[PDB]
Amino acid sequence: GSSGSSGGSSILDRAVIEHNLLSASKLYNNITFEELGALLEIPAAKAEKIASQMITEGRMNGFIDQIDGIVHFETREASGPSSG
């Protein structure tokens, strides 16, 4: 299984990615690791881990879809199904 797996390569501004992740979460309703990484200029592997790390860090709200490999971001003014 030839997977990306990007350890150390670029030490770009990690803060930017963190914010960008939050910015995109408020911008792009949904984006893939490939695109997300292209936005942060980072690899999907990094954006994937970062995205996941962000959620775990509480920085980002939502979950990562491994079924479609898309990052599910939260949208302003949202809750879900009708509770009751």
Q: How was this structure determined?
A: NMR
Distance (Å, whole) CA 50 – CA 61: 13
State how far the Cα of 23 lies from the Cα of 28, in Å rounded to an integer. Answer: 8
Token representation of residue 15: 């803060």
The letter for the amino acid at 2 is S
Q: Which two tokens stand for residue 67?
A: 């079924």
Q: Residue type at 22? A: L
Token digits for 62?
């939502």
- Domain extent listing, the chain: 1-84
Specify the CATH number for 1-84; select among 1.10.10.10, 3.50.50.60, 3.30.1600.10, 1.10.8.60. Answer: 1.10.10.10
Question: Closest Cα partner for 34 from 24, 44, 42?
Answer: 44
Q: Per residue, what are the HEC states of the chain?
A: CCCCCCCCCCCCCHHHHHHHHHHHHHCCCEEEHHHHHHHCCCCHHHHHHHHHHHHHCCCCCEEEECCCCEEEECCCCCCCCCCC
- Main-chain phi, psi angles of 2, to 5 degrees: -75, 95
* Helices 44-56, 14-26: inter-axial angle, 10-degree rounding: 80
